[PDB]
Design a protein around this ligand. Structure first.
Ligand SMILES: Cc1cc2nc3c(=O)[nH]c(=O)nc-3n(C[C@H](O)[C@H](O)[C@H](O)COP(=O)(O)OP(=O)(O)OC[C@H]3O[C@@H](n4cnc5c(N)ncnc54)[C@H](O)[C@@H]3O)c2cc1C
Ligand SMILES: Cc1cc2nc3c(=O)[nH]c(=O)nc-3n(C[C@H](O)[C@H](O)[C@H](O)COP(=O)(O)OP(=O)(O)OC[C@H]3O[C@@H](n4cnc5c(N)ncnc54)[C@H](O)[C@@H]3O)c2cc1C
Ligand SMILES: NC(=O)c1ccc[n+]([C@@H]2O[C@H](COP(=O)([O-])OP(=O)(O)OC[C@H]3O[C@@H](n4cnc5c(N)ncnc54)[C@H](O)[C@@H]3O)[C@@H](O)[C@H]2O)c1
Ligand SMILES: NC(=O)c1ccc[n+]([C@@H]2O[C@H](COP(=O)([O-])OP(=O)(O)OC[C@H]3O[C@@H](n4cnc5c(N)ncnc54)[C@H](O)[C@@H]3O)[C@@H](O)[C@H]2O)c1
Lengths: 401, 401
């Protein structure tokens, strides 16, 4: 590993990586450049508890496993020269590097049809965003959310709890089309509708006039605030300019290597192999950011260590639904454990492909999730009758493997 | 550039690259490993003149601009160790390298529903394939082609000229869906149908029984020979095993760099940025193989040289149609120069995006193609009236830019 180490971005992936470098035994220089003028913080609370409690000191990331790191907060890396091995900073300084790590994440995609709008329109990515939205979540106000993914739905739940009227516009015929089983998506729509969310499927926004949103069916929605959660775009501009292979995300191998010698990348900014699908994908989960960061650091310090190998998974807390999703959304088979019901929701889904577990969902059923992720990891082929059977406990079934 | 240079694959991309290394001034060792036991040869004649004239000595690639190269023909690279900087060969030998170049191309995709068939089924990629098919193109025989792309259609034309009855099965509703304007595809279907080709659209093969092919509509086609032209899969196995970033093709930047230090890749095996679309794609054209090979070599010898920057283009000779296609298949606008007619076909298409030329097609109109590629290269925005106007000659219009 070539010193000094410079990391661009100070999000979860960055913090996780630098903490692992130190824990693995690297004692040379580490400098982290973070464009946000904020003590590094975790994003999941921004759509939930922060949106509701407003204390940023409850959401900071623990940097104590990363001693002796200089964090340049409020500074933007403007470019890097991979021949000179330097990074140019917005404050006029230049940093030298032996190893450069791009952990610059992703930015919310903006709505092109609302580009010249005159009502409040916000995205939800940063603490600044969350505070700005927080200030607008007054009881009885009218919130329109654009996008029925995890941002929109987590915010929908938080807003309804605060007594805010919520309408939500989604272009697809379903919610969470990105990385969720249809059975889950259907249930989640039923849940939100029952909580008073006004869902609009297969509708695109065509624009707005004076505090009113226009749709593709030729109709209107008036709103006090719009929050746009329509996905992200990788923050890969420095990589594109420097000649790295990128396409809405920096291509990396399991060691986090880019196409440019001595430059690595990790987290939301990367496109990487999903071992379950065998395809290159942006894996934009909290667990990826942490675990890919850790694996890349571990292998830089110890080249004998394996490359990143974890299978993808996430959670989403949407009001009364604590959702956990691992692996692939579908296979050739779905097994449902429990009844799927709005009365005290509690169930598990298991996706199989030719008898092999390729994915799993738990809704208010955390006890089942860890054993299913272990079965997933080893490509388990359990008895499908037993997988369905309510009498089977999965912790023991996983233990038998 | 670190000597010695080892190239895996001895196709057009490989020959083009090694000739450029020598021409640019690199005088160190170059060793090329080619699995086919054939003097390097060009593939386009295999669906046409070779299929009809059968002389392989008319199709060899000119290696004289590549002096002092050892060509290991009939040898397969089995693996490489990018730490040890060695390549393991099927003949028991090992080659050292300073720089490793993966130019291993792509293999025809096989039909999963014909996997256990008992009639002749061939793909068309190699001289061996072409000879085997050649031997079967007897007058009045029944050929079924699976796939309505450039292989299938070029072969269809050659087979009809030889007096062979031709049926063709395509899964899409159109021919050449991969990289051809709809207007072209529609015309090409009319042309082949008029030449006696029995076209079947939106049909998938479900299998075969005793010299008869079964389709998804529940019908049959009996045939003496099947040729399968359903696309290719990148030959990226050595790269996948060695830990390079790959996904049906090796990701490279404009310098041909993979994610592994000292390992480059070029030609059909690569996924690379298409500057017109700004997306990563397999660019599987003859011009890419040659020109990407040349650009990668040039920049290895002279690091001040620019990365690969050419925009994609190809030709396809299908009987009486000499087709040339550059850039993107569609924009927001198509301009048609000439009438589109089976009576002495001759026309040009121009695809535009917000007034900018993004693609072009010429059918039996070669004079127009080079000037349109020049307009394409600079993102020209000519007068759209003039582009349509028959009186306009494009060579002069391009010259004005
Ligand atoms: C509201 C919200 C809720 C979420 N809830 C969940 C959840 O429950 N489950 C889950 O799995 N995930 C959730 N996610 C968390 C998300 O998965 C992680 O935040 C993300 O994966 C972390 O990835 P990262 O560190 O690579 O990128 P980021 O967190 O985006 O960090 C990158 C940082 O680099 C900075 N940067 C970019 N360019 C430059 C530059 N040139 N110079 C300097 N700095 C730069 C960025 O501004 C940013 O601060 C949520 C996200 C949001 C926004
Ligand atoms: C019938 C036919 C007609 C065509 N007509 C046209 C046309 O008119 N227009 C057009 O634009 N293009 C046409 N193409 C030509 C095509 O575009 C070029 O042949 C191709 O782009 C060349 O790419 P390449 O050199 O990267 O790969 P390849 O030509 O596939 O060469 C790669 C070589 O590497 C070998 N190899 C693979 N793995 C190993 C290994 N482990 N060890 C050693 N060797 C290995 C392969 O077997 C192969 O010999 C046609 C192709 C075919 C098959
Ligand atoms: N629980 C969690 O894991 C969680 C929670 C919040 C945020 N995040 C992360 O934050 C990032 C952003 O999340 P997100 O929810 O914005 O993205 P998302 O990709 O999860 O969902 C975006 C949704 O918007 C829809 N959409 C796309 N274009 C639209 C348009 N033009 N109009 C209306 N709808 C449109 C999509 O079909 C999709 O359903 C993601 O990386 C996500 O993983 C994760
Ligand atoms: N003129 C030329 O540039 C030329 C000529 C011959 C070959 N080639 C090269 O050779 C390679 C192979 O060419 P190709 O024609 O096989 O591929 P192609 O991608 O050009 O076309 C394959 C066609 O088969 C269809 N198809 C896919 N699956 C099918 C299935 N299950 N059953 C029936 N049809 C199916 C596709 O829709 C497509 O139309 C390509 O890289 C091509 O560029 C080029």
């Amino acid at each position: 590993l070539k010193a000094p180490v410079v990391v661009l971005g100070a999000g979860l992936a960055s913090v996780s990586f630098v903490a692992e470098l130190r824990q693995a035994g690297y004692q040379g220089l580490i400098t982290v450049v973070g464009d946000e003028a904020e003590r590094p913080y975790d994003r999941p609370p921004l759509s939930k508890d922060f949106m509701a409690h407003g204390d940023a000191e409850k959401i900071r990331l623990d940097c104590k496993r990363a001693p002796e790191v200089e964090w340049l907060l409020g500074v933007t890396a403007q470019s890097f020269d991979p021949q000179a091995h330097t990074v140019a900073l917005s404050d006029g300084r230049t940093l030298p590097y032996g190893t450069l790590v791009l952990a610059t994440g992703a930015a919310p995609r903006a709505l092109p049809t609302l580009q010249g709008a005159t009502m409040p329109v916000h995205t939800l990515r940063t603490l600044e965003d969350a505070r700005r939205i927080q200030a607008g979540l007054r009881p009885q106000s009218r919130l329109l959310i654009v996008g029925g993914g995890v941002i929109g739905l987590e915010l929908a739940a938080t807003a309804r709890t605060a007594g805010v009227h919520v309408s939500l516009v989604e272009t697809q015929p379903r919610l969470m089309s990105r990385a969720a089983p249809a059975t889950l998506a259907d249930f989640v729509a039923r849940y939100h509708a029952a909580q008073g969310v006004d869902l609009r499927f297969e509708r695109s926004v065509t624009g707005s006039v004076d505090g009113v949103v226009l749709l593709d069916d030729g109709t209107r929605i008036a709103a006090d605030m719009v929050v746009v959660g329509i996905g992200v775009l990788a923050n890969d501009a420095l990589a594109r300019a420097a000649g790295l292979a990128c396409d809405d995300g920096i291509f990396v191998d399991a060691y986090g290597r880019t196409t440019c010698p001595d430059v690595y990348a990790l987290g939301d900014v990367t496109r990487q192999r999903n071992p379950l699908s065998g395809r290159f994908e942006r894996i934009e989960t909290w667990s990826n950011a942490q675990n890919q960061g850790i694996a890349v650091a571990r292998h830089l310090v110890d080249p004998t260590a394996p490359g990143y190998a974890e299978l993808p998974w996430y959670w989403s807390d949407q009001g009364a639904l604590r959702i956990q999703v691992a692996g692939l959304a579908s296979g050739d088979e779905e097994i449902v454990r429990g009844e799927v019901s709005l009365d005290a929701p509690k169930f598990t889904l298991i996706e199989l492909q030719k008898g092999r577990i390729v994915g799993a969902t738990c809704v208010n059923n955390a006890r089942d999730f860890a054993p299913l992720r272990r079965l997933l990891a080893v490509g388990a082929k359990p008895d499908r009758a037993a997988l369905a059977d309510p009498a089977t406990d999965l912790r023991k079934l996983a233990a038998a493997v």
